[PDB]
Design a protein around this ligand. Structure first.
Ligand SMILES: *[C@@H]1O[C@H](CO)[C@@H](O[C@@H]2O[C@H](CO)[C@@H](O)[C@H](O)[C@@H]2O)[C@H](O)[C@H]1NC(C)=O
Ligand SMILES: *[C@@H]1O[C@H](CO)[C@@H](O[C@@H]2O[C@H](CO)[C@@H](O)[C@H](O)[C@@H]2O)[C@H](O)[C@H]1NC(C)=O
Ligand SMILES: *[C@@H]1O[C@H](CO)[C@@H](O[C@@H]2O[C@H](CO)[C@@H](O)[C@H](O)[C@@H]2O)[C@H](O)[C@H]1NC(C)=O
Ligand SMILES: *[C@@H]1O[C@H](CO)[C@@H](O[C@@H]2O[C@H](CO)[C@@H](O)[C@H](O)[C@@H]2O)[C@H](O)[C@H]1NC(C)=O
Ligand SMILES: *[C@@H]1O[C@H](CO)[C@@H](O[C@@H]2O[C@H](CO)[C@@H](O)[C@H](O)[C@@H]2O)[C@H](O)[C@H]1NC(C)=O
Ligand SMILES: *[C@@H]1O[C@H](CO)[C@@H](O)[C@H](O)[C@H]1NC(C)=O
Ligand SMILES: *[C@@H]1O[C@H](CO)[C@@H](O)[C@H](O)[C@H]1NC(C)=O
Ligand SMILES: *[C@@H]1O[C@H](CO)[C@@H](O)[C@H](O)[C@H]1NC(C)=O
Ligand SMILES: *[C@@H]1O[C@H](CO)[C@@H](O)[C@H](O)[C@H]1NC(C)=O
Ligand SMILES: *[C@@H]1O[C@H](CO)[C@@H](O)[C@H](O)[C@H]1NC(C)=O
Ligand SMILES: *[C@@H]1O[C@H](CO)[C@@H](O)[C@H](O)[C@H]1NC(C)=O
Ligand SMILES: *[C@@H]1O[C@H](CO)[C@@H](O)[C@H](O)[C@H]1NC(C)=O
Ligand SMILES: *[C@@H]1O[C@H](CO)[C@@H](O)[C@H](O)[C@H]1NC(C)=O
Ligand SMILES: *[C@@H]1O[C@H](CO)[C@@H](O)[C@H](O)[C@H]1NC(C)=O
Ligand SMILES: *[C@@H]1O[C@H](CO)[C@@H](O)[C@H](O)[C@H]1NC(C)=O
Ligand SMILES: *[C@@H]1O[C@H](CO)[C@@H](O)[C@H](O)[C@H]1NC(C)=O
Lengths: 621, 177, 338, 48, 49, 48, 39
């Protein structure tokens, strides 16, 4: 089988840092580490992990000895050379067979190559080892599978990494894993014989798309190439005015629910850290927006309806809810896009001897449609009497939120302010605190124009934007031009060098050379992008100057244009076909030879009639 | 594929979760696998319609090329078709077209008609061909010169309307006897 | 007769999740569901290329007309290529290219002028903005005219012999006589009314060009195919502005507004909508490509019969007793002159 | 030999939302997913 | 076919649930019926070809 | 119970089918089995 | 571009009541009103 997997792997032809030992630097740990070492008998004992390597964060020790290992999760203090001096919060010990095998054929010719790979995905520390009797090369090249040894649930934040040594009277090879896609050839016995990285070369990547180890002759569409923004420009309102949120929360007479005081927040910069500060938060249920990423949004208009209300009515307030308050006092719209906030206030809505200031309505002739105030004093009718007064069968509409400093939790004076946003296509006046960077044109760059996040190339335009116009679009309804908030100029929006990569190669049983196509893009853009190292593909095909050919079907890299004409072998497109021809062998591109150029001898009285014939047997399937 | 569920195994999700939510993941697996299966069936329908078109083509090819001689050029292989032989292949058929292909040819001369005595002679079937010195009648796809005779040609004309006519003598097997 | 359609190579990752890592990760949870889509579109492209090859590359040898053009009085200068024109295309052919307008040429490398569009970016820039490109056909519209000219010179100078084996020269009046003999009329009748038939042939050539000109659209089939493909692509791109029952219709602001483990539901809703729309497009393209394949096989058979010979089947090579047929290249199709 | 099939002209709006305004509103959020269907059936009828 | 919703009658489930959540079952019915109609249109196109 | 249709719950891997002896070459770390389509094919007996 | 919109738009060839002045009746407001004046 040729099973393909996506997992943290050491990239092929990646870089391992080679050290020596005759002091023992700390190496960063991230997404796992590959380790290898060639030693005569033993000079390395184990490894230690963790963070800050002190008696404040849980750490690890993978020291070995002649007969076992010493896996433990502890909070050791230090050794500065018995390898620790603290065992206070140090449990989860582990003992098993040793990790180091050393064998000699009556000679120390074996440096006992020891390959190790560790990683910490969702805890569950995984160690893989494989000892190959050393050959002539320390870190050679032949393939060597790596087998797991142990996997036990560590569950600590592994960030730093260190090694231990031995005593006595060229090793330590270390690499880092990143997430890639790998294709592995499985032997009949179940072992691994050959593997190919899908981020190394065009032939390797195709091999990883035609899922096999033989790429036969032809051209294969594999992936797409995309230029990566070298910079990231954000342009936000010219003003940096802090919103009056403070005055909204530093109020003393938050109106009751029956008359929900609605304030307006406009032409300001909303920094919600001040919202957090004046808030012993109890209920921060945000619905339309994640509360954490509230400072990265631009809103058109912000509404802050504030009212003090009981405990359970805090749970009452939500879109599509019900109750004596949610139906006749304050109905949130179902499609609410905003945040509601409740923090306990028993120090301002309470006093000795009582306080009956606040009010609420239990009696309304109908439901309260979303975002409506029904301040009115009309006695609810019961039966059929036109009665106007208080008493039985004649009920006064609104009753009292009587408050004293002594209730239970559900009946204390909770303070509630709700934030309603308008997150649609409009010129926003409220944004988060961000630094308006400069403007760079004619360069792929991530843009955040007034909260409209995207990527592409900006430039000057000769559009005729009317004064109220803010955005641009096409019959497909995609943002095309955005007016600069701080320069009032028209900037178009473009895709960041989108195309498609096709690799022209002959059969791998013939040669390993390849020719790459970037579809429907001038090579001048990919040449500068490659020289700027901003291309999404990592495989960088060689460019010798003679291997560039702007076709009508894109542009070709890796193949030299030959002015001769031959029968098509591999169709590229637009009358251009590439083939593997001798020089001593290489890949060339050429124009179609539709056939042998022939001329007939037509004349007034000249005729050709065969004096012979042949019998040909063709086949049709 | 998990299709957005906790796990891709039905006996796993069933034996690990209780209906309430769970069903949700099983419904997700339903709306994934059913849509995948529908994709498969649609592609199979496309492919089977294409194969049906190819099979009708093959059946007509058999009925024409094998059960007879087909006058449609290039249909039963390249060249003047003569006969075909069918052969069975896995999930298909293989035809062996036997075609008559011409060979070595030579410039000679030709004229649309031959005017013997005020009358234009045209070939009953074949080509008026000239070695270069003695005019001849022959076939169309094979050179077989024959002496011009009143049976090899039919006469109708006035020797004055046909362009390219040439002067020559046509023979009759009747005057001699 | 249509011969081919525009070749498309719509890409899953970019079309559905514009450069969004979390969106691509959640798309990977649907498996290779769309590797099937890329494979199907590649198959469609290869099938269109094979259709063009089958229709047009029916001669292995590229013939050329004699330097002089006197075919017994027959005037053909409307269908052989014109040396003066740079494209080396016949006058009949030029009307065809001037009466068909392609929404997306494809062989434009339009990247670089979407910034220079100044005004609102057009359909092509919009499609490039969301990952739907058009591959260009392998055979260009220029060498396809070379193939058409080769076929034309094979018929008028060698009769139907070149469709079988070696091209044997034969005078055009004589080929006319033999085709006449093929429909049961003595060859002599032609040799007494050669002048009349030549004049009628010249008149018909001139009138058919005018008939294909003053007409609003006699190319209705080819323009219909082009319109169908362009309209399918437009409907494809337009679904990217459809909320599909989610908070918004843009991946970039959806990710920038909701944290991962709540934006997951919305992103999955977008994935389900967009994959379903893409499956709709791919299935419709498959169906239309099968239809075009049938039409192109019909065109190839029509070429091999009417062009490379006389066809006895009545009403196949146009109305009336068939004599010849002169092919002409058209944008994404072929046009016959029976 | 068959020459034609029955010409059908189903309509999304009713078939999916029987005279229901809120269902029409919900369907509108799916884009022009049904203009394509009406076009396809109409083209099929014309082709028949 | 309920398609995994409360009921298969739209007129019933609009009057039995309030929009907020109803919307979910209506969307389920939408994606069920629309996919069924998609299968029908694809098969009809195949039959027409 | 080999060579017989049986419900198996191997080390948490539940399923249905028939089990029997095999001549695989499982490496010592190997525990499960599968195919190109990742269908559970072989299970090492945890108590044998 | 031929963009299509759904919003509150005055219907074409609809009723527009024309007034005069020389007392200022209150007019109903519903889904917005279109106001025009020449002076
Ligand atoms: C709700 O209560 C708020 C606090 O009093 C009001 O906001 C402020 O009110 C002060 C009063 O001096 C103003 O100076 C300030 O500009 C701001 O308006 C707010 O108006 C009020 N809203 C309602 C609807 O009652
Ligand atoms: C027509 O063509 C035949 C083959 O294409 C010729 O037959 C050949 O005869 C030679 C001997 O003369 C053999 O050596 C050869 O193998 C082949 O059989 C045939 O002669 C030829 N006839 C004429 C008239 O040209
Ligand atoms: C014209 O066709 C004649 C066929 O009858 C050829 O004449 C032949 O010539 C030989 C002597 O060379 C005679 O013996 C024979 O009977 C026959 O007449 C003649 O070659 C041919 N002309 C040319 C130019 O090929
Ligand atoms: C074929 O032979 C005819 C007589 O056998 C020729 O007719 C002659 O034409 C000349 C003028 O060209 C007259 O002066 C003469 O009286 C006789 O009619 C005829 O020309 C000739 N044609 C060719 C092509 O040789
Ligand atoms: C063959 O048909 C051509 C049609 O284009 C003729 O060209 C014509 O040339 C005249 C000028 O002599 C133009 O006025 C006319 O518009 C047309 O282009 C060509 O002469 C004709 N040749 C023969 C021999 O019939
Ligand atoms: C290795 O350490 C373990 C744990 O203390 C001990 O039991 C074992 O004997 C040691 N092996 C040696 C010293 O060879
Ligand atoms: C030891 O550290 C762990 C990890 O943070 C912690 O959960 C545990 O409470 C600690 N034990 C103590 C403080 O006794
Ligand atoms: C460290 O690991 C623990 C193990 O569960 C986890 O709770 C914690 O989130 C990790 N640290 C960070 C910063 O994620
Ligand atoms: C009111 O303002 C004072 C002034 O510093 C501050 O200490 C207090 O926290 C504010 N209270 C609220 C509810 O914002
Ligand atoms: C933005 O503010 C700066 C400083 O007040 C000013 O110089 C500049 O003209 C302003 N730009 C706009 C577009 O208002
Ligand atoms: C693509 O072709 C060349 C090479 O890059 C150059 O003129 C320009 O970049 C492009 N041309 C056009 C017409 O866009
Ligand atoms: C050979 O190729 C070059 C470009 O590589 C071209 O300019 C030249 O015309 C070609 N020569 C011939 C004879 O075609
Ligand atoms: C054919 O005849 C015409 C008219 O007599 C003449 O113009 C042309 O040159 C002739 N060609 C040959 C090859 O004899
Ligand atoms: C006929 O003569 C012409 C003129 O030389 C020549 O090009 C052609 O090949 C000849 N055809 C033959 C000999 O079959
Ligand atoms: C399982 O444990 C039992 C009890 O000690 C023992 O008899 C048996 O040999 C063990 N088998 C395996 C495979 O571990
Ligand atoms: C406008 O009002 C007049 C007067 O009532 C009426 O006759 C006319 O029909 C109205 N316009 C339309 C389009 O009905």
């Amino acid at each position: 089988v040729l099973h393909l997997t996506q997992d943290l792997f050491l990239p092929f032809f990646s870089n391992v840092t080679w050290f020596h030992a005759i002091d023992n630097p700390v190496l960063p740990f991230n997404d796992g580490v590959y380790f290898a070492s060639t030693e005569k008998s033993n000079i390395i004992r184990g490894w230690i992990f963790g963070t800050t390597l002190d008696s404040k964060t849980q750490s690890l020790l993978i020291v070995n000895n002649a007969t076992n290992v010493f896996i433990k999760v502890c909070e050791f203090q230090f050794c500065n050379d018995g390898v620790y001096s603290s065992a206070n919060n140090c449990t989860f010990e582990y003992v098993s067979q040793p990790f180091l095998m050393d064998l000699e054929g009556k000679q120390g010719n074996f440096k006992n190559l020891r390959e190790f790979v560790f990683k910490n995905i969702d805890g569950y520390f995984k160690i893989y080892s494989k000892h190959t009797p050393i050959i002539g090369r320390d870190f050679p090249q032949g393939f060597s599978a790596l087998e797991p040894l142990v996997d036990l649930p560590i569950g600590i934040n592994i960030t730093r990494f260190q090694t231990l040594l031995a005593l006595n009277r060229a090793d330590y090879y270390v690499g880092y894993l990143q997430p890639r896609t790998f294709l592995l050839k499985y032997n009949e016995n179940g072992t691994i014989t050959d593997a190919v990285d899908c981020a190394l070369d065009p032939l390797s990547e195709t091999k990883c798309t035609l899922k096999s180890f033989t790429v036969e002759k032809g051209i294969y569409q594999t992936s797409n190439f995309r230029v990566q923004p070298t910079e990231s420009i954000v342009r936000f309102p010219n003003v940096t005015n802090l919103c009056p949120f403070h005055e909204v929360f530093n109020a003393t007479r938050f109106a009751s629910v029956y008359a929900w005081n609605r304030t307006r927040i406009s032409n300001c910069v909303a920094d919600y850290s001040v919202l957090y500060n004046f808030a012993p938060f109890f209920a921060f249920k945000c619905y339309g927006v994640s509360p954490t990423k509230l400072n990265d949004l631009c809103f058109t208009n912000v509404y802050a309806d504030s009212f003090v209300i009981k405990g359970n009515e805090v749970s009452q307030i939500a879109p599509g809810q019900t109750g004596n308050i949610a139906d006749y006092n304050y109905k949130l719209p179902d499609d609410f896009t905003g945040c509601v906030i409740a923090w306990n206030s028993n120090k301002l809505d309470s006093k000795h001897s009582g306080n009956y200031d606040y009010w609420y309505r239990l009696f309304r002739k109908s439901k309260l449609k979303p975002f409506e105030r029904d301040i009115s004093t009309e006695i609810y009718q019961a039966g059929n009497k036109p009665c106007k007064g208080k008493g039985p069968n004649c009920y006064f509409p609104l009753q009292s939120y009587g408050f004293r400093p002594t209730y239970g939790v559900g009946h204390q004076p909770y303070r509630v302010v709700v934030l309603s946003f308008e997150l649609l296509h409009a010129p926003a006046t409220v944004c988060g605190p961000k630094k308006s960077t400069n403007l760079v044109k004619n360069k792929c760059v991530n843009f955040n124009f007034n909260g409209l996040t995207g990527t592409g190339v900006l430039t000057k335009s000769n559009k005729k934007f009317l004064p109220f116009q803010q955005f641009g679009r096409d019959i497909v309804d995609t943002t095309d031009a955005v007016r600069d908030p701080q320069t009032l100029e028209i900037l178009d929006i473009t895709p960041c060098s989108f195309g498609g990569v096709s690799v022209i190669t002959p059969g791998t049983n013939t040669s390993n050379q390849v020719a790459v196509l970037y579809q429907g893009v001038n090579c001048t853009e990919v040449s500068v992008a490659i020289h700027a190292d901003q291309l999404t593909p990592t495989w960088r095909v060689y460019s010798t100057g003679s291997n560039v050919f702007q076709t009508r079907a894109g542009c070709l890299i890796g193949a030299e244009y030959v002015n001769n004409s031959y029968e098509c072998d591999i169709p590229i497109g637009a009358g251009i076909c590439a083939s593997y021809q001798t020089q001593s062998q290489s890949i060339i591109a050429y124009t179609m030879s539709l056939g042998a150029e022939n001329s007939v001898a037509y004349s007034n009285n000249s005729i050709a009639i065969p004096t012979n014939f042949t019998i040909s047997v063709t086949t049709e399937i | 594929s998990k299709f957005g569920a906790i796990s891709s195994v039905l006996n796993d999700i069933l034996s690990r979760l209780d209906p309430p939510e769970a069903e949700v993941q099983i419904d997700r697996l339903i709306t994934g696998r059913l849509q995948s299966l529908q994709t498969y069936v649609t592609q199979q329908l496309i492919r089977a319609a294409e194969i049906r078109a190819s099979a009708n083509l093959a059946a007509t090819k058999m009925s024409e090329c094998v059960l007879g001689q087909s006058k449609r050029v290039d249909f039963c292989g390249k060249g003047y078709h003569l006969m075909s032989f069918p052969q069975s292949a896995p999930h298909g058929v293989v035809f062996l077209h036997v075609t008559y292909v011409p060979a070595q040819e030579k410039n000679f001369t030709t004229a649309p008609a031959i005017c013997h005595d005020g009358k234009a002679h045209f070939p009953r079937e074949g080509v008026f061909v000239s070695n270069g010195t003695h005019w001849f009648v022959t076939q169309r796809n094979f050179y077989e010169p024959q002496i011009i005779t009143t049976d090899n040609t039919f006469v109708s004309g006035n020797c004055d309307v046909v362009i390219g006519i040439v002067n020559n003598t046509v023979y009759d097997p009747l005057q001699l006897e | 007769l249509p011969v081919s359609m525009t070749k498309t190579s719509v890409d899953c990752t970019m079309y559905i999740c514009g450069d969004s890592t979390e969106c691509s990760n959640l798309l990977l949870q649907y498996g290779s569901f769309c590797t099937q889509l890329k494979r199907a579109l590649t198959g469609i492209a290869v099938e269109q290329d094979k259709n063009t090859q089958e229709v047009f590359a029916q001669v292995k040898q590229i013939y050329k007309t004699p330097p002089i053009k006197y075919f017994g009085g027959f005037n053909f200068s409307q269908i052989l290529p014109d040396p003066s024109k740079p494209s080396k295309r016949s006058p009949i052919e030029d009307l065809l290219f001037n009466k068909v307008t392609l929404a997306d040429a494809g062989f434009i490398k339009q990247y670089g002028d979407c910034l220079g569009d100044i005004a609102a970016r057009d359909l092509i820039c919009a499609q490039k903005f969301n990952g739907l490109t058009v591959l260009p056909p392998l055979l260009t519209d220029e060498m396809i005219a070379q193939y058409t000219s080769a076929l034309l010179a094979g018929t008028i100078t060698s009769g139907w012999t070149f469709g079988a084996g070696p091209a044997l020269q034969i005078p055009f009046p004589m080929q006319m006589a033999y085709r006449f003999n093929g429909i049961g009329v003595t060859q002599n009748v032609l040799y007494e009314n050669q002048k009349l038939i030549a004049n009628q042939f010249n008149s018909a050539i001139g009138k058919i060009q005018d008939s294909l000109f003053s007409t609003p659209s006699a190319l209705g089939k080819l323009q219909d195919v082009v319109n169908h493909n362009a309209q399918a692509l437009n409907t494809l791109v337009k679904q990217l502005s459809s909320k599909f029952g989610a908070i918004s219709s843009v991946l970039n602001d959806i990710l920038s507004r909701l944290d991962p483990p709540e934006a997951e539901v919305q992103i999955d809703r977008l994935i389900t909508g967009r994959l379903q729309s893409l499956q709709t497009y791919v299935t419709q393209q498959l169906i239309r490509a099968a239809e075009i394949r049938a039409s192109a096989n019909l065109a190839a058979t029509k070429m091999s019969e009417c062009v490379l010979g006389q066809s006895k089947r009545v009403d196949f090579c146009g109305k009336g007793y068939h004599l010849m047929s002169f092919p002409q290249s058209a944008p994404h199709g072929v046009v016959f002159l029976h």
